Design a binder for this molecule. Structure first.
Ligand SMILES: CCCCCCCCCCCCCCCCCC(=O)O[C@@H](COC(=O)CCCCCCCCCCCCCCC)COP(=O)(O)OC[C@H](O)CO
Ligand SMILES: CCCCCCCCCCCCCCCCCC(=O)O[C@@H](COC(=O)CCCCCCCCCCCCCCC)COP(=O)(O)OC[C@H](O)CO
Lengths: 802, 802
């Protein structure tokens, strides 16, 4: 899927480049520059305003999603989320930090469910995805002659196509209206439809109409931006029609920005009618104003919020797994783009002639080549920054500033140097955000980033051909070292960048295979047990069963237990140790998973570590509820119906002759345990009955008039914060209150030693819930972490099987 | 002492500046530049060669010290040490990284004693310090007329002065030869002299003569360097005489480089005879070639060795407390100097006229001012880098590269930008060397660094006056913003730098006083005990006595116990916890000590942490020996006279009716303990007898036929690595073998539980040594850490009193 989808997009981009080259054959860069300069100031200020209007309409797009999913949020929060998600989706879609991710990051602070957000994003996407053809047909129906002229098709054909589209639209609307279940409504604005297999959620009539108006206003404003930039204006209907088609074509192409394809379509539509140069200039200004500008605004906004949050709340925020690393990766990538493009384009003559005196002539050529290499390194270090490396942050901070220096020593291009330096400032300001002390060579291969790198290099070479089209091909251009000669510098640069990218890509591809997963040995198990003791978490006990492999921190202070199942690696709980060790461990696991081409999954995680999973790109699903009784409040001289039932149970148990005794680890009656375990059997998160496992923990045994009837090992630490029990077996013939006596006896015993809390157990998603509730415990949600895209049930079913 | 010595040096520098200003009044920068250009290539290549010759002779200087102190080292090591110590001493003497420090760092890897190195340095210093006047007199005796003309004094006066000096020299030599103790000789080349109070160590005749030849060749080569640079050459005798005097005057002035004063004296000597401009040019080239160049070579050498050591030995080196932070602090300081000086000097007209087109005219003035501020910040962040901060490393890495950018946007001064960038490269390459995550605002005030900052600012202003001496004073110069106007830019720069330095200096001086030292409370004590348990070191037990204050790491994982005594804070042992926590703690202590204006001292430290103390500027003295028995090798069925004596003791003890029993912490007979403690009493590193202290540890009591006779608390951890005993009391009336039975019983008991090692105790600097040796233990040295300068006995005596 991943390589196929990459290759498909890459080829589509490549084709669109070739199309644009063969379409702008007549135009030379001089003409284009003149066309760009031609545009009047009121037109620019108009487009700059229509951008704002069109982005304010995109807030309503988020409002419709909020209403559909039934999410109550503050208006300031909804606005911020809407703007930032749309801005960053539209520009760098699906490559870095998609709109969904930005929604899910921003809205998880308010404590909205992952399913709700997911639904919001899906609605926001499919809204445009399904309302695009309808608006295209509606626009086509106005002035068929103009539309036919634009598309270069017969009037009859486009007419019947429009009629066929609107007929299919109303037909589907009627069909879903037929299967409308009454009564139940998940939200005020939501219908449920029943087909037979699954119940699907569709918008209501009012919401559907309101979003369709919103979509209409959105695409209108978007098209108007591009309309104002054109000196000569074709009929609005046809223009809008083609814009819609082009937008569609760009989105389907799965090209990050829609660049290459969108421009190809517009140019093909109005190659002759509007000319090439004025259109190309309008397209560039459109892309700079409507895509690039908002993205940079969003980048700065979210950086600002992150910095403000860090400054205000200093103590609570410890590890910093916020919203800086992804933005900085984006800005760094853009920087590398800016370096590579500059390297392709020839310098200004005036700047070169001034510089020629100050700097030696060969240094310029050297500077230029190195600056091109640095550009490619900046492309590939985006991934590093994304994964919160510290090495990557150090290297990138150096390169961005060296690159900014060479940008002044290549042709005194201060516009480049300014941006590179500004980026390097922001990168240095967020120093804490990059903590991981891992090796850069250990970063996994990422097809996507390499794909994007190749695309950018392609676009640089395209720009090289288009810029240096006034020089004849010659073999002597390669060696030609002189000031005025721009084309040699570009050629050298392009070759150097192409070789360096190829080298690094091949080096990453051909690397030593990772070691296979093995079970832990005696030493590892002992270390794991040591870690568990010197910690708060007693749930770590299931590490010692020697059934699931162990990932150890470099400091051997904290560890994480995981097991491979099919194509997905599952981690049993949160990592065991201090917070700073936990974050590094969660990343370490993600790295490992990626190396082995497996989905990372975290089973039964607490709420406190959720943002660390959100970082590495997981989503929290409500798995179950975990009960824990607080022994400080709980006392044997308290009131409450359940409490009176418990004391009655305890008193009867004592009178009947039930005795509970605790055996230290090692000194256990293995014969009696084996007997009861066999009796219970006759009649991953489980805990085996191997003696080795049992000798680690102290076992509480209850006896009924002397004979051993039931037992339950106890997970403990050296601290007296929390205590839990994993394995717990009872004899089928035992009295019904015997298990409850054992259970309450445990609670009282831990009260005696003075443990703050006592972990009862988890209920997923009836009897177990009631039984746990009968002790009057404290409930706490337990989550499941799965990749964000689409893996809701497959992973849960697979884990349930395991 | 510190403020007085600072003010004295600062005033001497100030005066020497004023002297040089009033002496080079006639010369304008044009004439000076012409004088510098005048010097021929053979003269430069001659001076560059005579520098090398003179530095090769400085190796023999180290050789004489090695022989005197009696230190056997490899020739490569001695060479490296000699070169680097002399190079860095001569340039940045006593301000940053003195020659002594560099010797003591480089030679402590081979495992040479601190007393030996100290002696080596003292000899190397005093050699020149005492051989300078003798050579001055010897030179004076040759051609009195020329010497008299040079000094502008009567021939008779200089003659009798020379005669008086040589008479005093031979008189002192005879006087020390009189009190020559025969027989004993610490080294082959060393005499001991007895005056009555203390025995002093003087060189032998052969060594004295050889070093005096070495000193003669050294100063000759040094003077020759400056001789070749002069076009017209005065008589060698007189010239050498004045050079000697000037060198002396510079050294006594305690000016880091000898700059200001040395030049003043030379200029005053040959103001009229040789002219000002040619002499000034010779002096500049001398300073650049003989001082600055070697320093930069040494800086690079030692950086290279550090990098090579890091690359080769990756695993053993963990925390990196090597030789990078001091060098980088030096290079950063030099960078800031280079920025400030450039800012004072006016730009080249050609470069300004080229730049005037590219850059807006006001930007140049802005760039120039900011670059001057950045220069002053680079001055003050040297201290930060020195103290291995990470904040300081991040900030400095940014500033050096921004400063390098502004250096190209001020007057396109690429020579500056190259150096700043090269420094910023090296600083980024040694990223690990700066680990401390402390706040920059928390750095203590340092009079020395501020003193050096003020000096540099002074020298910048001096350069400003001397460079812009072709412009008349006017009030309108401040506001004058134009390209060609250089003097306004310099004036603004100088003012901006002066205000920023004043502001920061005052801000550091006026700061909230540090909190006073308090005793630990119940919570702190409990935390300390927790830390001790989850650790290897059982010696941490004496923390719990609640007698000495506790410094806790930010992570509350490791801590360090210290107590103030008079004017020196003593830390009781190494910090307790992991290595990474230990380094930060040792620094944290140094910070604290500096805040309270107290000498840091570390009492009883192990060898493994020595380099962490060496970093913060301490020296290890051999305090005593600590015995520890290894229970793995030791067994009850072994052979050896001492072992047979032990088993005989054990068997007799058992037969007599001595019984040893171990009581858990809390469950102890306090009555019996109090009784025995009182009986023993009747008849900081001590351990009190307060019940609170005793309830923490398990007490071993021995009984003689039922009655309690002796006891000894046991320091333990949860691990079974090491065990120790602090407090140990016996009844006066007890049998002589009873204490030995208790002692051997402990050893056997710990064998039973299976503890690897068992700490016996320390003997400082007779009976105790024999008693410990009778168990056949393993000896390990125990050190004392005291400030490097001169605090050998005062601290030890003060600690002994406490
Ligand atoms: C050729 C145009 C018409 C064809 C339309 C379709 C083509 C589709 C396929 C090709 C994709 C577009 C290729 C062209 C890109 C822009 C080319 C360009 O103009 O590049 C300039 C330089 O390249 C760029 O500026 C490209 C930037 C593109 C990306 C924009 C990102 C901006 C933000 C970066 C991060 C900022 C960080 C700080 C703030 C957070 C060089 O021209 P100049 O005259 O402006 O400069 C001359 C000299 O070299 C220097 O002055
Ligand atoms: C005035 C000389 C005669 C008087 C002698 C006695 C005076 C004593 C009191 C004053 C002390 C000396 C003051 C003069 C310093 C040098 C002045 C100078 O020439 O400064 C130049 C610039 O300042 C310096 O270069 C000063 C450097 C001094 C320190 C040297 C350190 C070098 C190493 C730094 C670290 C390197 C890092 C990388 C390698 C590890 C500016 O002149 P320029 O024509 O060379 O340049 C013009 C334009 O501004 C730029 O080209």
């Amino acid at each position: 899927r991943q390589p196929i989808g990459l290759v498909f997009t890459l080829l589509l981009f490549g084709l669109a480049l070739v199309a644009c080259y063969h379409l702008l054959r007549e135009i030379d860069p001089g003409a284009l520059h003149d066309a760009i300069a031609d545009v009047p100031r009121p037109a620019l200020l108009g487009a700059l305003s229509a951008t704002a209007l069109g982005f304010v309409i995109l807030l309503g797009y988020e409002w419709s999603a909020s209403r559909f999913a039934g999410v109550t949020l503050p208006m300031r929060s909804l606005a911020t989320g809407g703007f930032s998600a749309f801005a960053i989706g539209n520009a760098v879609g699906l490559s870095l930090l998609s709109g969904g991710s930005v929604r899910y990051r921003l809205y998880s602070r308010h404590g909205i469910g992952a399913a709700e957000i997911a639904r919001m994003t899906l609605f926001a996407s499919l809204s445009l995805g399904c309302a695009l053809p309808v608006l295209a047909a509606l626009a086509a129906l106005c002035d068929l002659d103009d539309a036919a002229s634009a598309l270069h098709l017969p009037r009859a054909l486009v007419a019947v196509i429009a009629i066929a589209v609107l007929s299919l639209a109303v037909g589907l609307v009627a069909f879903l209206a037929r299967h409308r279940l009454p009564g139940e409504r998940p939200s005020p604005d939501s219908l449920l439809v029943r087909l037979g297999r699954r119940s699907l959620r569709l918008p209501g009539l009012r919401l559907s109409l309101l979003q369709l108006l919103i979509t209409a206003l959105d695409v209108a404003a978007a098209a108007t931006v591009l309309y104002l930039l054109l000196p000569e204006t074709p009929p609005f209907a046809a223009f809008l029609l083609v814009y819609l088609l082009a937008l569609a074509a760009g989105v389907l192409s799965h090209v990050p920005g829609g660049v290459g394809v969108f421009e190809a379509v517009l140019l093909a539509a109005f190659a002759g009618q509007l000319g090439a140069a004025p259109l190309a200039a309008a397209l560039l200004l459109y892309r700079l104003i409507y895509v690039v500008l908002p993205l940079l605004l969003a980048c700065l906004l979210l950086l600002f919020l992150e910095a403000r949050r860090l400054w205000v709340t200093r103590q609570a925020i410890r590890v910093a797994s916020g919203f800086a690393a992804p933005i900085l990766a984006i800005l760094v990538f853009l920087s590398g783009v800016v370096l590579l493009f500059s390297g392709a384009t020839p310098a200004i003559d005036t700047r070169l002639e001034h510089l020629g005196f100050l700097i030696p002539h060969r240094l310029i050529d050297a500077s230029h080549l190195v600056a091109s290499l640095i550009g490619v390194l900046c492309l590939l270090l985006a991934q590093g920054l994304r994964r919160r490396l510290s090495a990557a942050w150090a290297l990138t901070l150096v390169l961005l500033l060296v690159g900014a220096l060479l940008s002044l020593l290549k042709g005194f291009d201060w516009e480049e140097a300014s941006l590179l330096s500004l980026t390097a400032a922001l990168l240095a300001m967020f120093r804490r955000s990059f903590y991981r002390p891992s090796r850069l060579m250990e970063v996994p291969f990422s097809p996507l980033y390499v794909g994007a790198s190749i695309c950018v290099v392609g676009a640089s070479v395209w720009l090289l051909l288009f810029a240096n089209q006034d020089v004849h091909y010659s073999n002597q251009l390669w060696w030609q070292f002189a000031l005025d000669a721009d084309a040699p510098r570009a050629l050298r640069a392009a070759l150097g960048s192409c070789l360096l990218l190829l080298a690094l890509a091949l080096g990453w591809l051909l690397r030593a295979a990772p070691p296979a997963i093995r079970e832990p040995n005696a030493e590892e198990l002992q270390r794991a047990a040591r870690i568990i003791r010197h910690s708060d978490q007693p749930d770590g006990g299931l590490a010692l069963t020697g059934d699931k492999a162990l990932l150890f921190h470099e400091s051997d202070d904290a560890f994480l237990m995981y097991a491979r199942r099919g194509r997905s690696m599952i981690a049993l709980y949160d990592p065991i140790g201090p917070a700073m060790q936990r974050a590094e461990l969660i990343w370490q696991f993600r790295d490992l998973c990626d190396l082995h081409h497996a989905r990372p999954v975290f089973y039964q995680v607490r709420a406190e570590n959720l943002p660390f999973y959100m970082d590495i790109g997981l989503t929290a699903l409500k798995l179950g509820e975990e009960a824990r009784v607080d022994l400080l409040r709980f006392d044997l001289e308290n009131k409450g119906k359940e409490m009176k039932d418990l004391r009655y149970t305890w008193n009867r148990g004592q009178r009947d002759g039930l005795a509970l005794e605790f055996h230290e680890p090692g000194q256990a009656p293995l014969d009696e345990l084996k007997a009861i375990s066999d009796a219970w059997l006759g009649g991953f998160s489980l805990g085996r009955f191997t003696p080795a496992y049992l000798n680690f923990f102290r076992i509480a045994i209850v006896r009924h008039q002397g004979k051993p009837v039931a037992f339950a090992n106890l997970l403990e630490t050296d601290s007296r914060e929390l205590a839990s029990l994993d394995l717990m077996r009872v004899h089928p013939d035992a009295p019904k209150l015997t298990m409850e006596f054992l259970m309450l006896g445990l609670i009282l015993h831990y009260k005696a030693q003075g443990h703050a809390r006592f972990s009862l157990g988890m209920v997923p998603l009836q009897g177990l819930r009631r039984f746990k509730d009968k002790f009057q415990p404290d409930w706490e949600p337990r989550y499941l972490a799965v990749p964000a895209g689409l893996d809701p049930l497959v992973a849960l079913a697979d884990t349930a099987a395991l």
